[PDB]
Amino acid sequence: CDTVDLGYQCSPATSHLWGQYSPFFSLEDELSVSSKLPKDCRITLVQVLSRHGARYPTSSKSKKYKKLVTAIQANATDFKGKFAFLKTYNYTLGADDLTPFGEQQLVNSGIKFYQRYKALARSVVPFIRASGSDRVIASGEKFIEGFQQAKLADPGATNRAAPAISVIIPESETFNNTLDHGVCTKFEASQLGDEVAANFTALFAPDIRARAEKHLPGVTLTDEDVVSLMDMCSFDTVARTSDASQLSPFCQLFTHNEWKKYNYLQSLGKYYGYGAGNPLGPAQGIGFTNELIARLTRSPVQDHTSTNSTLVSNPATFPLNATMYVDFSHDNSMVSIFFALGLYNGTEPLSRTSVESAKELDGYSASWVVPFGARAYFETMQCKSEKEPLVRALINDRVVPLHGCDVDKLGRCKLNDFVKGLSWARSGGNWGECF
Ligand SMILES: *[C@@H]1O[C@H](CO)[C@@H](O)[C@H](O)[C@H]1NC(C)=O
Ligand SMILES: *[C@@H]1O[C@H](CO)[C@@H](O)[C@H](O)[C@H]1NC(C)=O
Ligand SMILES: *[C@@H]1O[C@H](CO)[C@@H](O)[C@H](O)[C@H]1NC(C)=O
Ligand SMILES: *[C@@H]1O[C@H](CO)[C@@H](O)[C@H](O)[C@H]1NC(C)=O
Ligand SMILES: *[C@@H]1O[C@H](CO)[C@@H](O)[C@H](O)[C@H]1NC(C)=O
Ligand SMILES: *[C@H]1O[C@H](CO)[C@@H](O)[C@H](O)[C@H]1NC(C)=O
């Protein structure tokens, strides 16, 4: 179901509609020109920003799901139609960690990165950081395994030293971490994302609730419970087999149209929680944006948001000339970073009452942007066509045309023009509003 090149391709009428719980699926050529290296161009730098792989529910969500399944089994006097499996379903999902399928997604991502950037990767040991979450570190380790596997199979590789994770950045309300939000006090108190999500859930869940209760006489559900049952479709799928090759029985409880609504609920939560829908959402991505500027320009970091001055000032923890960089992070920070970079500046604020497709949203959705195992590549290339280095952004293989600069038909801008266009991040944006 899942391959190095194309990601997850089984049951796409369901599995591509789980938002940030969808396994990565390649968006090569989807509302986009090819991501192939253009003729007479050579990559000179690449930054990768990768999410962790498919995981179990968080400890708190796992407790909530198990509670619900138990109550359904305690209360139902019959389990009708496609709900029949719920009589004997045994809840055994873990918590927080990667699933085996999620580990393999990250091995695959490391193979794909090597293959795509083979010309550089043959001689380069990437500089790697990970946010301090066990699933994120484990994802970095699995990516490195895949990178090394591919490099070992290439008789043209000259430097095969294994890359280490050189920096693990703590996750704390008081540690400035560009790969995980947490220090912006006002933002952390925001309820906007949850409120938008709750409002949209109240629109679509009642009809599903009524149908589920009809097939489970004796059971009383809430709107929240409907969402839990829908969450279980993704979590059970990515856990129950090593290769996620069998759709969970939870999945067919809901129709394709209902999956489109769930997919949009996820997009809304991310847009209003972490993206431009939140007044301090894109501010969470300023620190990484300034780190990326420093790497692209081979210059010291200029930032007073969520960079750590000690870490960015030491070449051991922040080299300015490493040619390949790979950072491991989470969905929410990645959303903020993509918005801070201006990559979704063609997306209109999402309707809170109506489902809008990724097409109508200029390529934005949670499943297109931050699926499990999501990756972004930020390239600098030197092309015969142009004296100045050109920048290109690929999000899950889709070319995402740059905003703020004189962009070409291939989605690229000249390096200096691109950096000039990031004036908002370069100034620190509205970070002061945090406090
Ligand atoms: C910055 O990093 C240093 C070195 O790891 C750490 O001791 C310090 O607590 C960090 N400060 C903040 C605010 O992140
Ligand atoms: C949720 O719906 C209520 C009542 O319809 C509305 O007044 C409120 O502003 C909505 N909240 C958000 C965050 O959209
Ligand atoms: C099961 O029954 C108990 C006792 O009446 C009730 O409080 C609970 O809400 C029910 N749960 C479900 C999911 O039906
Ligand atoms: C962490 O960032 C805050 C501002 O967001 C700043 O007060 C602090 O000095 C920074 N600390 C370090 C070590 O970068
Ligand atoms: C993206 O749009 C926001 C809101 O208009 C603006 O503040 C920001 O400067 C834009 N970014 C780029 C890179 O053009
Ligand atoms: C490039 O120079 C940096 C300082 O910016 C230093 O850490 C190192 O010598 C080089 N980076 C490597 C080896 O990746």
Burial letters 49-66, b for 16+ CB under 10 A, else e: bbbbbbbbbeeebbeebe
| Ligand 3 center to 74 CA (angstroms) | 8
- Answer yes or no: is 20 within a domain: no
- Answer yes or no: is 34 within a domain: no
- Answer yes or no: is 181 within a domain: yes
Closest residue CA from atom 6 of ligand 5:
424
d(C-alpha 275, C-alpha 110), whole Å: 27
CATH of the domain at 183: 3.40.50.1240
Closest residue CA from atom 11 of ligand 5:
342
Tokens of 242: 């090593």
Total count of domains within the chain: 1
Contact yes or no for 405/420 (Cβ under 8 A): yes
d(C-alpha 361, C-alpha 358), whole Å: 5
- 74 burial (CB, 10 Å; 0-12 / 13-18 / 19+) is exposed
- The closest ligand to the CA of 279 turns out to be 5
d(C-alpha 140, C-alpha 119), whole Å: 22
- Distance set, CA 227 to CA 202, 222, 363, 367 (Å): 10, 9, 25, 17
- Answer yes or no: is 217 within a domain: yes
- State which residues form the domain around 410: 45-434
Contact yes or no for 267/366 (Cβ under 8 A): yes
Q: Is the CB of 244 under 6 A from ligand 4?
A: no
- Enumerate the β-bridge partners of residue 49: 327, 376
Sign of CA dihedral 179, 185, 186, 191: positive
* HEC per residue, the chain: CEECCCEECCCHHHHCCCHHHCECECCCCCCCCCCCCCCCEEEEEEEEEEECCCECCCHHHHHHHHHHHHHHHHHCCCCCHHHHHHHCCCCCCCCCCECHHHHHHHHHHHHHHHHHCHHHHCCCCCEEEEECCHHHHHHHHHHHHHHHHHHHCCCCCCCCCCCCEEEEECCCCCCCCCCCCCCCHHHHCCCHHHHHHHHHHHHHHHHHHHHHHHHCCCCCCCHHHHHHHHHHHHHHHHHHCCCCCCCCCCHHHCCHHHHHHHHHHHHHHHHHHCCCCCCCCHHHHHHHHHHHHHHHHCCCCCCCCCCCHHHHCCCCCCCCCCCEEEEEECHHHHHHHHHHCCCCCCCCCCCCCCCCCCCCCCCCCHHHHCCECCEEEEEEEEECCCCCCEEEEEECCEECCCCCCCCCCCCCEEHHHHHHHCHHHHHCCCHHHHC
Contact yes or no for 281/339 (Cβ under 8 A): yes
Q: Is the CB of 426 under 6 A from ligand 5?
A: no
Amino acid at 328: F
- Answer yes or no: is 22 within a domain: no
Closest residue CA from atom 12 of ligand 4:
308
- Distance set, CA 426 to CA 29, 143, 241, 422 (Å): 32, 31, 45, 6
- Answer yes or no: is 32 within a domain: no
The atom of ligand 2 lying closest to the CA of 272 is 13
Sign of CA dihedral 409, 412, 414, 420: positive
Q: Is the CB of 407 under 6 A from ligand 5?
A: no
Task: Give the residue numbers marked as catalytic.
Answer: 52
Which residue in the block uniquely carries the two structure tokens 């045309």?
A: 401
- Answer yes or no: is 90 within a domain: yes
- Answer yes or no: is 17 within a domain: no
Backbone angles phi, psi at 97, to 5 degrees: -70, 160
Which residue in the block uniquely carries the two structure tokens 């004189």?
A: 406
Binding-site annotation: residue ranges for 1D-myo-inositol hexakisphosphate: 20-21, 51-52, 55, 58, 135, 180, 270, 330-331
